[PDB]
Scaffold this active site. Structure first.
Site, PDB file in Angstrom:
ATOM      1  N   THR A  16      64.759  23.166 -10.490  1.00  0.00           N
ATOM      2  CA  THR A  16      63.947  23.365  -9.300  1.00  0.00           C
ATOM      3  C   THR A  16      64.722  24.040  -8.176  1.00  0.00           C
ATOM      4  O   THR A  16      64.108  24.490  -7.203  1.00  0.00           O
ATOM      5  CB  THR A  16      63.402  22.023  -8.809  1.00  0.00           C
ATOM      6  OG1 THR A  16      64.471  21.068  -8.752  1.00  0.00           O
ATOM      7  CG2 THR A  16      62.322  21.509  -9.748  1.00  0.00           C
ATOM      8  N   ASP A  39      62.830  46.461 -29.628  1.00  0.00           N
ATOM      9  CA  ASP A  39      63.792  47.100 -28.742  1.00  0.00           C
ATOM     10  C   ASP A  39      64.705  48.025 -29.546  1.00  0.00           C
ATOM     11  O   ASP A  39      64.236  48.714 -30.458  1.00  0.00           O
ATOM     12  CB  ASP A  39      64.569  46.016 -27.993  1.00  0.00           C
ATOM     13  CG  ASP A  39      65.060  46.477 -26.638  1.00  0.00           C
ATOM     14  OD1 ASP A  39      65.841  47.449 -26.574  1.00  0.00           O
ATOM     15  OD2 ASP A  39      64.620  45.888 -25.628  1.00  0.00           O
ATOM     16  N   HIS A  69      71.242  47.058 -26.131  1.00  0.00           N
ATOM     17  CA  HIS A  69      70.173  46.504 -25.305  1.00  0.00           C
ATOM     18  C   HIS A  69      69.359  45.472 -26.075  1.00  0.00           C
ATOM     19  O   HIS A  69      69.115  44.363 -25.584  1.00  0.00           O
ATOM     20  CB  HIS A  69      69.277  47.635 -24.799  1.00  0.00           C
ATOM     21  CG  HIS A  69      68.238  47.197 -23.815  1.00  0.00           C
ATOM     22  ND1 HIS A  69      67.114  46.488 -24.182  1.00  0.00           N
ATOM     23  CD2 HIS A  69      68.152  47.374 -22.476  1.00  0.00           C
ATOM     24  CE1 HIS A  69      66.381  46.246 -23.110  1.00  0.00           C
ATOM     25  NE2 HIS A  69      66.989  46.772 -22.062  1.00  0.00           N
ATOM     26  N   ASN A 161      61.741  48.628 -13.885  1.00  0.00           N
ATOM     27  CA  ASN A 161      62.868  48.620 -12.960  1.00  0.00           C
ATOM     28  C   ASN A 161      62.761  49.754 -11.945  1.00  0.00           C
ATOM     29  O   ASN A 161      63.757  50.376 -11.573  1.00  0.00           O
ATOM     30  CB  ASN A 161      64.183  48.698 -13.731  1.00  0.00           C
ATOM     31  CG  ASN A 161      64.285  47.634 -14.811  1.00  0.00           C
ATOM     32  OD1 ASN A 161      64.065  46.450 -14.553  1.00  0.00           O
ATOM     33  ND2 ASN A 161      64.605  48.054 -16.030  1.00  0.00           N
ATOM     34  N   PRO A 175      46.827  43.766 -18.558  1.00  0.00           N
ATOM     35  CA  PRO A 175      46.668  42.438 -17.942  1.00  0.00           C
ATOM     36  C   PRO A 175      46.656  41.280 -18.930  1.00  0.00           C
ATOM     37  O   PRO A 175      46.948  40.150 -18.521  1.00  0.00           O
ATOM     38  CB  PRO A 175      45.328  42.550 -17.200  1.00  0.00           C
ATOM     39  CG  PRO A 175      44.600  43.658 -17.884  1.00  0.00           C
ATOM     40  CD  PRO A 175      45.644  44.622 -18.358  1.00  0.00           C
ATOM     41  N   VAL A 177      48.668  40.691 -21.487  1.00  0.00           N
ATOM     42  CA  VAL A 177      50.005  40.246 -21.868  1.00  0.00           C
ATOM     43  C   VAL A 177      50.693  39.635 -20.654  1.00  0.00           C
ATOM     44  O   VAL A 177      50.099  39.535 -19.575  1.00  0.00           O
ATOM     45  CB  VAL A 177      50.840  41.397 -22.458  1.00  0.00           C
ATOM     46  CG1 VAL A 177      50.096  42.049 -23.616  1.00  0.00           C
ATOM     47  CG2 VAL A 177      51.179  42.419 -21.387  1.00  0.00           C
ATOM     48  N   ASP A 200      52.805  38.507 -13.760  1.00  0.00           N
ATOM     49  CA  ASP A 200      52.414  37.136 -14.029  1.00  0.00           C
ATOM     50  C   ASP A 200      53.495  36.130 -13.684  1.00  0.00           C
ATOM     51  O   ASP A 200      53.171  34.997 -13.331  1.00  0.00           O
ATOM     52  CB  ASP A 200      52.049  36.981 -15.509  1.00  0.00           C
ATOM     53  CG  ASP A 200      51.027  38.003 -15.966  1.00  0.00           C
ATOM     54  OD1 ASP A 200      51.367  38.845 -16.824  1.00  0.00           O
ATOM     55  OD2 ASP A 200      49.883  37.962 -15.467  1.00  0.00           O
ATOM     56  N   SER A 224      63.942  44.178 -18.109  1.00  0.00           N
ATOM     57  CA  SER A 224      64.249  44.003 -19.515  1.00  0.00           C
ATOM     58  C   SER A 224      65.113  42.797 -19.753  1.00  0.00           C
ATOM     59  O   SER A 224      65.201  42.334 -20.882  1.00  0.00           O
ATOM     60  CB  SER A 224      64.947  45.247 -20.074  1.00  0.00           C
ATOM     61  OG  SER A 224      64.000  46.329 -20.158  1.00  0.00           O
ATOM     62  N   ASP A 260      59.250  30.082  -4.403  1.00  0.00           N
ATOM     63  CA  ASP A 260      60.686  29.897  -4.272  1.00  0.00           C
ATOM     64  C   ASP A 260      61.457  31.205  -4.188  1.00  0.00           C
ATOM     65  O   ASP A 260      62.664  31.176  -3.927  1.00  0.00           O
ATOM     66  CB  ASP A 260      61.224  29.067  -5.446  1.00  0.00           C
ATOM     67  CG  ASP A 260      60.874  27.598  -5.326  1.00  0.00           C
ATOM     68  OD1 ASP A 260      61.361  26.947  -4.377  1.00  0.00           O
ATOM     69  OD2 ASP A 260      60.111  27.095  -6.177  1.00  0.00           O
TER      70      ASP A 260
END
Length: 279
Positions: A16, A39, A69, A161, A175, A177, A200, A224, A260
């Site tokens: 938290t 990937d 990657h 990014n 939307p 996924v 999301d 990523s 947060d």
């Protein structure tokens, strides 16, 4: 379980509060689940994968990860030291060449591959696909991501990014996924992380230490790198029976750390991926 001196990202999804260094998680650890890492491929021989990682498909001359990657993302999903779900099965779909590059059509074929290939794997706890890739908007890349999601695979994609609205990028703008932004260890939005209403969730994205090719490790930043945290979290939550593939993104957001993160633009969710584990 408790992994002392974990990477900060692992400690954050079980906390938290920021600024702790112990990753807490139920010892089931994603056992019986599967995460496809679509990937640059995975260095399956890496000792951090413990035989749980493997290459199942490549569209290039080799399935070997010549970039690092995809090995890094797989390591954040399920490597023993840097992974969220330390017991999940890792399948590599090399849709990106060793430059990190890939035609959208090869990327679309990889998503349809996973949508069918999962019927060849033993994933009684469910299937996850981690898409740590993305480019400009494409309705066909979006629809492939929707088919993959519709097929019964939890799909987690990077927001991008670009420090822009992820609305102009695929598959981040699909939307159905789970589009993932990136945060840093001080609970700030990563300076590069895309935003917008299509996002999301946020996962740890800045300076993430994970596996690297050549049997090594390194720390790198990107949405990523937040995507495999949520992808690994989903495989973890499905193994515990807390959610299904069709519901996991909505579940992860319901249970996330609310309000947060700082520098979250108006209209973008302020949700941080949180496993909600109580030791």
């Amino acid at each position: 379980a408790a992994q002392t001196n974990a990477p900060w990202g692992l400690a954050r999804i079980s906390s938290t509060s920021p600024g702790t260094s112990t990753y807490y998680y139920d010892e089931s650890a994603g056992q019986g689940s599967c995460v496809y890492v679509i990937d640059t491929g995975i260095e399956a021989s890496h000792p951090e994968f413990e035989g749980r990682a493997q290459m199942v498909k490549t569209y290039y001359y080799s399935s070997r990860d010549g970039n690092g990657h995809g090995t890094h993302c797989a390591g954040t999903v399920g490597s023993r030291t840097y992974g969220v779900a330390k017991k999940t099965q890792l399948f590599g779909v090399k849709v990106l060449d060793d430059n990190g590059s890939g035609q959208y059509s090869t990327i679309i074929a990889g998503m349809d591959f996973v949508a069918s290939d999962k019927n060849n794997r033993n994933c009684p706890k469910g299937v996850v696909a981690s898409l740590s890739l993305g480019g400009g908007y494409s309705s066909s890349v979006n629809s492939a991501a929707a088919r993959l999601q519709s097929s019964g695979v939890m799909v987690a994609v990077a927001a991008g990014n670009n420090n822009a609205d992820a609305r102009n990028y695929s598959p981040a703008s699909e939307p159905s996924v789970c589009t993932v932004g990136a945060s840093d260890r001080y609970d700030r939005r990563s300076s590069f992380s895309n935003y917008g209403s299509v996002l999301d969730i946020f996962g740890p994205g800045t300076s993430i230490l994970s596996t690297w090719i050549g049997g090594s490790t390194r720390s790198i930043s990107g949405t990523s790198m937040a995507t495999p945290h949520v992808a690994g979290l989903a495989a973890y939550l499905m193994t515990l029976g807390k959610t299904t593939a069709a519901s996991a993104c909505r579940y992860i957001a319901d249970t996330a750390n609310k309000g947060d993160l700082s520098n979250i633009p108006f209209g973008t969710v302020n949700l941080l991926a949180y496993n909600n584990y109580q030791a």
